[PDB]
Amino acid sequence: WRAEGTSAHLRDIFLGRCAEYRALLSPEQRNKDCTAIWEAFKVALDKDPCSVLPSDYDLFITLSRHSIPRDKSLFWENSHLLVNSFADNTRRFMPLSDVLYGRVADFLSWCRQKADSGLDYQSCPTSEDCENNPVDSFWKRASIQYSKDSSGVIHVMLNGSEPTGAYPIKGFFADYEIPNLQKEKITRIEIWVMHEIGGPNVESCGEGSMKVLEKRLKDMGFQYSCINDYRPVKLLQCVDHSTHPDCALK
Amino acid sequence: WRAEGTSAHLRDIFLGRCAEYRALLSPEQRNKDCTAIWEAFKVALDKDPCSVLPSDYDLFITLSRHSIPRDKSLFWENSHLLVNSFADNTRRFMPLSDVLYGRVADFLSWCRQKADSGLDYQSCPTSEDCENNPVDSFWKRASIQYSKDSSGVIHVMLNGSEPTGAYPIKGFFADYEIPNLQKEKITRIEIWVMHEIGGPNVESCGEGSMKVLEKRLKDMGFQYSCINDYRPVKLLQCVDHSTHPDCALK
Ligand SMILES: O=P(O)(O)O[C@@H]1[C@H](O)[C@@H](COP(=O)(O)OP(=O)(O)OC[C@H]2O[C@@H](O)[C@H](O)[C@@H]2O)O[C@H]1n1cnc2c1ncn1ccnc21
Ligand SMILES: O=P(O)(O)O[C@@H]1[C@H](O)[C@@H](COP(=O)(O)OP(=O)(O)OC[C@H]2O[C@@H](O)[C@H](O)[C@@H]2O)O[C@H]1n1cnc2c1ncn1ccnc21
Ligand SMILES: *[C@@H]1O[C@H](CO)[C@@H](O[C@@H]2O[C@H](CO)[C@@H](O)[C@H](O)[C@H]2NC(C)=O)[C@H](O)[C@H]1NC(C)=O
Ligand SMILES: *[C@@H]1O[C@H](CO)[C@@H](O[C@@H]2O[C@H](CO)[C@@H](O)[C@H](O)[C@H]2NC(C)=O)[C@H](O)[C@H]1NC(C)=O
């Protein structure tokens, strides 16, 4: 397996994150059983590391699913850390990592040993090793759910400094979220194409892969919008480049 | 009593955070036993909620203590959330909440029931109910250690929009940290007086309580400097006031 093995102390981390997230939920939907959620989740830890399907996580989703506030969904690509810091633990936006079923697995890795009941802390399969590995099947299932439950203004943060372009035609956003957006309950889609401070401007709104994305969203009937270096996020990037000319204040 | 009852699912949260923090420690001191750390901490939970002393957490500290990088300490008052966001989980600085023993308790509450053996989720004592409550004694002990183990350039974030003054003459910083800073291994102390965006400038460097703090530190023989609205932090505050004139980019 050419990927990170199971995360040490997966269970404690999972339950801890789950318990802390409960506090963020509204009292009405605060009734969540972290233990049951973990049990449902571990069904994948009792299977062949190449025989886990997205549907295997259905129970896990049923037990953890909760509503996402209108206009708070934030999708992204090649911007993990920035998205998490900007979202600020649900305070500004609620990306998948800030939704219960996403929060418990953010950054973690897991898979059962090839031919032994115990978890494999040595390595886990990538899409290359095999399509149906625990981690990818999990995110496919969580992505679909996250997309289906989003409504209002859809925000998307992309990385215009990524060498392969801002929009990966083969990725979770393209293959599992866009096709699952409920057109009827979506007002518009606003894209933020961020560039590293002084970093390379590989692509901006309307260029390369951005034209492909825009065309698709438009052919799908969505009201489309694209902003280069959305200020609030630029200001956050600037925190680490205070003396740079792109970050100077008036 | 008068304070919040112990946090729901305290143990799970505690262990979860402990396990996640282990990953941030260098392989040299990563060998931490969260369960044992939890048991040492629990010693205070099996005592009268008004008879817990800072020394009751000596074992807890012994088992969770670790080094703090030179120049990375960050003290503060009236800016807990700003400090946590800026520190960015160990990336930029290492405040007490980003040190193992502080991390497991950041924002939590705890105390045993008055005459019962179980935890009291209804309420916990405050400084007014009785001085020796579990939470206050915990932070006194934790503050002392954090100070004793700090070195190099000392940073301090104060709130200059605080009505009663940026430097509370009575508080954890004045009463438990400053007295435990070890000059022999300290270069200088740098203060950052932050003001709310547009917010009121109650006090700035060299004003009111700031006069007191400066004189106290100088009388102790420390090199001292103060900065109003330290740029990096100002930029972070700006993320939520992007259109405000104080946050306009050049
Ligand atoms: O370690 P773990 O358990 O694997 O958790 C993963 C993993 O540790 C890390 C991957 O970073 P990467 O730069 O490859 O970033 P990606 O390309 O993988 O993320 C882009 C996708 O996330 C979305 O939110 C966007 O809209 C888009 O669909 O982000 C966590 N992660 C958070 N949300 C997702 C996620 N991994 C797959 N997802 C799929 C969906 N939502 C996710
Ligand atoms: O819920 P919990 O478990 O009680 O966790 C507490 C509590 O939930 C919250 C209190 O916010 P407050 O504005 O009153 O701020 P404070 O006056 O209480 O804290 C300011 C002090 O922290 C330092 O780091 C600064 O340099 C300064 O000495 O911050 C958490 N906290 C984190 N570090 C500390 C802490 N509480 C007391 N401390 C004392 C030391 N380090 C701490
Ligand atoms: C946006 O994409 C750029 C380029 O892929 C990322 O910056 C690179 O990050 C890697 C790993 O940290 C480094 O090895 C490269 O040297 C970086 N290149 C450049 C030009 O900076 C950047 O981290 C991405 N931004 C976000 C928020 O994920
Ligand atoms: C700095 O201190 C100010 C003043 O106490 C804090 O602002 C107050 O915050 C409370 C709670 O959110 C509000 O009800 C008040 O209206 C605020 N007053 C003002 C003048 O803004 C502020 O939160 C503190 N800053 C930080 C980072 O903690």
Side-chain angles (χ1 to χ4, degrees):
Chain A
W1 300 153
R2 292 66 179 294
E4 294 295 292
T6 295
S7 296
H9 309 293
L10 174 61
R11 182 168 183 279
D12 296 328
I13 291 171
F14 189 103
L15 297 179
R17 290 187 176 179
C18 182
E20 286 205 77
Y21 193 89
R22 278 188 70 181
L24 299 183
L25 295 173
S26 62
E28 32 272 48
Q29 55 189 184
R30 187 118 62 194
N31 187 312
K32 288 290 190 295
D33 190 325
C34 289
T35 297
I37 293 174
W38 161 254
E39 294 297 348
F41 171 88
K42 63 188 293 63
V43 64
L45 298 188
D46 297 309
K47 296 178 176 291
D48 168 67
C50 281
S51 306
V52 177
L53 305 166
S55 55
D56 288 310
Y57 292 104
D58 284 337
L59 247 161
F60 161 74
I61 297 301
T62 296
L63 296 171
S64 51
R65 183 175 181 196
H66 68 260
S67 75
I68 305 177
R70 198 135 187 292
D71 309 315
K72 286 304 187 184
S73 291
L74 174 53
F75 297 78
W76 58 274
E77 289 281 17
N78 307 308
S79 315
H80 202 199
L81 295 175
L82 186 59
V83 164
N84 280 179
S85 289
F86 186 64
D88 186 25
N89 189 39
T90 241
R91 232 256 302 165
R92 297 187 188 103
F93 291 84
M94 195 173 298
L96 180 43
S97 62
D98 284 335
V99 155
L100 182 48
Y101 47 90
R103 174 68 63 93
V104 298
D106 203 18
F107 289 110
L108 307 181
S109 196
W110 60 91
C111 69
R112 191 201 69 188
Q113 295 185 61
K114 196 171 301 186
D116 195 62
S117 67
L119 293 181
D120 193 338
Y121 299 89
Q122 195 61 59
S123 67
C124 289
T126 61
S127 187
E128 301 313 296
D129 288 295
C130 60
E131 183 185 10
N132 306 308
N133 62 73
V135 168
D136 292 327
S137 284
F138 171 92
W139 290 112
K140 292 183 173 179
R141 184 68 194 71
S143 288
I144 295 172
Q145 195 56 51
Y146 182 75
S147 306
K148 286 185 174 187
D149 297 341
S150 290
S151 68
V153 177
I154 296 302
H155 302 89
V156 184
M157 193 195 287
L158 299 174
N159 190 339
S161 291
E162 167 59 42
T164 56
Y167 178 60
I169 41 66
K170 286 304 176 183
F172 293 99
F173 186 53
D175 300 317
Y176 294 87
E177 303 182 307
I178 288 181
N180 288 290
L181 288 172
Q182 302 295 293
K183 221 170 72 65
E184 63 270 42
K185 56 177 182 173
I186 291 184
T187 58
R188 64 193 181 72
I189 301 175
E190 182 182 301
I191 314 294
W192 304 327
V193 179
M194 308 304 299
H195 300 96
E196 296 300 296
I197 305 299
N201 174 15
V202 178
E203 278 187 349
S204 289
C205 289
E207 317 172 340
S209 69
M210 285 311 294
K211 286 191 63 175
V212 175
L213 170 58
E214 161 171 38
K215 181 172 186 289
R216 218 241 268 208
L217 293 183
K218 283 188 173 181
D219 290 333
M220 283 177 88
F222 290 104
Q223 192 184 307
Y224 184 87
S225 169
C226 189
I227 301 172
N228 284 309
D229 297 291
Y230 179 55
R231 188 54 66 74
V233 180
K234 176 61 57 188
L235 289 169
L236 177 57
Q237 293 172 300
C238 277
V239 172
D240 290 303
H241 304 280
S242 68
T243 71
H244 188 102
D246 295 327
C247 297
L249 296 174
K250 286 165 62 181
Chain B
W1 298 93
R2 297 177 53 175
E4 295 197 306
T6 134
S7 305
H9 303 289
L10 173 64
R11 197 175 89 94
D12 292 311
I13 295 173
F14 190 104
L15 296 172
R17 292 185 180 175
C18 180
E20 282 200 83
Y21 192 88
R22 283 191 66 175
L24 297 177
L25 292 167
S26 60
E28 308 294 292
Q29 301 187 65
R30 187 138 60 188
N31 73 305
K32 289 288 186 292
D33 183 332
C34 291
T35 295
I37 288 165
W38 165 248
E39 294 289 347
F41 170 82
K42 197 155 64 179
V43 174
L45 284 178
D46 307 317
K47 285 184 163 59
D48 163 66
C50 283
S51 304
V52 181
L53 299 178
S55 57
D56 286 325
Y57 291 97
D58 285 345
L59 271 156
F60 163 75
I61 293 296
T62 298
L63 294 180
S64 60
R65 181 188 187 189
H66 66 263
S67 73
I68 302 177
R70 188 184 178 82
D71 306 317
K72 296 313 188 65
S73 291
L74 170 53
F75 295 77
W76 57 272
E77 289 280 27
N78 308 307
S79 40
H80 192 190
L81 292 179
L82 180 57
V83 162
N84 280 182
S85 284
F86 183 61
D88 192 26
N89 182 47
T90 272
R91 275 196 60 249
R92 306 198 182 91
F93 291 79
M94 191 173 298
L96 184 48
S97 55
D98 289 340
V99 151
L100 185 55
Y101 47 93
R103 171 62 65 79
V104 299
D106 196 28
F107 290 113
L108 312 183
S109 190
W110 61 90
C111 68
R112 189 197 73 190
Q113 289 183 53
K114 272 295 291 296
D116 194 62
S117 61
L119 305 172
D120 188 324
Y121 300 89
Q122 191 54 57
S123 65
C124 287
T126 60
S127 51
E128 305 315 307
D129 287 298
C130 63
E131 180 175 298
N132 309 310
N133 56 272
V135 169
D136 290 334
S137 289
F138 172 90
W139 290 114
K140 289 179 186 180
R141 181 71 187 76
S143 288
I144 286 171
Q145 195 57 54
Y146 182 75
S147 304
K148 290 186 175 182
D149 295 336
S150 297
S151 73
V153 176
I154 299 295
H155 305 278
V156 192
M157 193 190 300
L158 299 181
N159 192 331
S161 292
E162 173 49 52
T164 56
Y167 173 57
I169 291 180
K170 194 285 177 50
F172 285 99
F173 183 58
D175 302 330
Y176 294 89
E177 313 191 306
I178 289 182
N180 289 289
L181 288 171
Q182 296 191 171
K183 190 153 61 66
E184 54 269 31
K185 63 187 196 184
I186 292 178
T187 285
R188 58 183 178 81
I189 304 178
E190 175 178 303
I191 314 300
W192 306 329
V193 183
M194 308 301 301
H195 302 101
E196 295 301 294
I197 296 302
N201 171 36
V202 180
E203 282 185 352
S204 289
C205 295
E207 293 171 17
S209 63
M210 289 310 308
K211 296 167 183 157
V212 177
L213 173 57
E214 185 174 330
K215 189 180 174 184
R216 186 185 177 183
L217 297 184
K218 283 186 176 181
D219 289 338
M220 289 166 93
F222 287 108
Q223 279 310 303
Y224 175 98
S225 65
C226 183
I227 303 173
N228 288 310
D229 298 292
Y230 182 47
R231 188 49 65 79
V233 183
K234 179 56 63 184
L235 288 164
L236 177 54
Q237 289 175 297
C238 278
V239 175
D240 295 304
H241 306 282
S242 64
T243 69
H244 193 100
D246 299 320
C247 297
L249 294 179
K250 198 182 180 301

